[PDB]
């Protein structure tokens, strides 16, 4: 309403500090345990490591978001821009696709037990991550070639596209990211875990109910974290691209939604590894 601004940017810089350290320490701790003690000979630990590694590299980009919000410019050239963007995108899909194949692995484990023998092997887990490496590297190479700086008096770092001939490939790219990094994931992880519980509910007394309650609570939480963290920023980006506004509160809310996306990566070590009944022991 007035000239004096509220200390919201200080609060934002403080949340970023928590999410950054919690995420960087957490995921570095998980990898350390797997490298020095578990040796990742099982398919389970292979997923846990690759998720921890992807979430460890996504938090690496986080201080750049923090800095850009407060400075309101990218003065570090196109060379760093291309690097920071590619790391931010590549490991976003590597984080979300590993997270989704864990859902598919747990789904096949219960619903296709004979297939589980031929799918939940250390080799198969490795191949699945080699595929997740390829699918992400496509966006990674795209971020290295298209990433750059634009003068449109505050310097911006983003994927640069030609504006000629009523082009809309900036919007188009965002819709592809929205469906392959949120829509098909959310739906795959919702369908897989729902069908998984439905299978266990269809088993015929206290032992079944004890596991069903523990698993349903776990399932609700893991997807709740993915929905609570990615839904705000995916919608914000998509609506800003279809429209929106560039206010102070609108800029503050955007980087708060950015922080939520990084929160998913910071909670994954606690939600999947420091809750794994095999990783604790």
């Amino acid at each position, epitope marked *: 309403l007035g000239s004096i601004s509220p200390a919201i940017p200080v609060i934002i810089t403080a949340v970023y500090s928590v999410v950054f350290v919690v995420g960087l320490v957490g995921n570095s701790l998980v990898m350390f345990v797997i490298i020095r003690y578990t*040796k990742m*000979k*099982t398919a*389970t630990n292979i997923y846990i490591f690759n998720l921890a590694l992807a979430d460890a590299l996504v938090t690496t980009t986080m201080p750049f978001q923090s800095t850009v919000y407060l400075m309101n410019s990218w003065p570090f050239g196109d060379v760093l821009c291309k690097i920071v963007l590619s790391i931010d995108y590549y490991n976003m899909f590597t984080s979300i696709f590993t997270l989704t194949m864990m859902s598919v692995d*747990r789904y096949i*484990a*219960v619903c296709h*037990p*004979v297939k*589980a*023998l*031929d799918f*939940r*092997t*250390p080799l198969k887990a490795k191949i699945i991550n080699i595929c997740i490496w390829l699918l992400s590297s496509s966006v990674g190479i795209s971020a290295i070639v298209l990433g750059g700086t634009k003068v449109r008096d505050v310097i911006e770092c983003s994927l640069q596209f030609p504006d000629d001939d009523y082009s809309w490939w900036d919007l188009f790219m965002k819709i592809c990211v929205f469906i392959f990094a949120f829509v098909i994931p959310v739906l795959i992880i919702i369908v897989c875990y729902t069908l998984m519980i439905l*299978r*266990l509910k*269809s*088993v015929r*007394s*206290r*032992e*079944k109910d004890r*596991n069903l309650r523990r*698993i349903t609570r776990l399932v609700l939480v893991v997807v709740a974290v993915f929905v609570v963290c990615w839904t705000p920023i995916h919608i914000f980006i998509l609506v800003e691209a279809l429209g929106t506004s560039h206010s102070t509160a609108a800029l503050s809310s955007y980087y708060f939604c950015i922080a939520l996306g990084y929160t998913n990566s910071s909670l994954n070590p606690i939600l999947y590894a420091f809750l*794994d*009944e*095999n990783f604790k*022991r």
Partner: nanobody
Amino acid sequence: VQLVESGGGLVRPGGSLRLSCVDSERTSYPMGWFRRAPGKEREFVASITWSGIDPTYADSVADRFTTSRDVANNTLYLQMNSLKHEDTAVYYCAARAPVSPYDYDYWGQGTQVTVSS
């Protein structure tokens, strides 16, 4: 017989065997695998939770063997691939009563597995 064990016998070295243990009377849950070599003592092979989601494996066979549980048919499976002359043993099914980690209540009769020429 309570724990119905099958899928053993002779196999060529580097060959595969899918062991299966089922309790049709539903008096227990087959959730574990143990093996006893001609000389060596009782050795843990692999375990899995009631849900059939979390499979535990011994470092020795973790790389080759794969276990699964058919919650619907109350059946436990043990896929044994790239079988070496060290895997030749009597494989026992471990079942847990309906009424505590990696401890079984009902053992198996045995489904002797031989890896020879």
